[PDB]
């Protein structure tokens, strides 16, 4: 009964998908469970980072056990297909 807002941009599509997810943290594996289609993707998430000239970078996450970065109180991902 406690939550973070997860939203991702999927394989190009410019309107993103948003949805509520339960529990103070989210991991890449939890995130991967939201995806509707199967296959091989790379996963990037918006994240603030002081060593880049305009603040943000999209961090790649590979391991399901990882905690996903948070940005402006949301989780924001780009999901990209390995062509």
- Closest approach of Hg ion to the CB of residue 29, in Å: 19
Separation CA 45–CA 59 (nearest Å):
5
In the bound state with Hg ion, the residue whose beta carbon lies nearer, of 1 and 54, is 1
- Give residue number: closest CB to Hg ion: 11
Q: What is the dihedral of CA 24, 37, 41, 62, to 10 degrees?
A: 30
- Closest approach of Hg ion to the CB of residue 24, in Å: 10
In the bound state with Hg ion, the residue whose beta carbon lies nearer, of 13 and 72, is 13
Residue numbers after which the chain is interrupted (C to N above 2.5 A) read none
Separation CA 17–CA 6 (nearest Å):
8
Where do contacts with Hg ion occur on this chain (CB under 5 A)?
Answer: 1, 11, 81
In the bound state with Hg ion, the residue whose beta carbon lies nearer, of 1 and 20, is 1
């Amino acid at each position: 009964c406690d939550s973070i807002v997860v939203a991702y941009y999927f394989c190009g599509e410019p309107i993103p998908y948003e949805t509520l997810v339960r529990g103070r943290a989210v991991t890449l594996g939890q995130f991967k469970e939201l995806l509707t289609k199967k296959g091989s993707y790379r996963y990037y998430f918006k994240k603030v980072s002081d060593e880049f000239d305009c603040g943000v970078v999209f961090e790649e996450v590979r391991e399901d056990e990882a905690i996903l970065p948070v940005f402006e109180e949301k989780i924001i991902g780009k999901v990209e297909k390995v062509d």
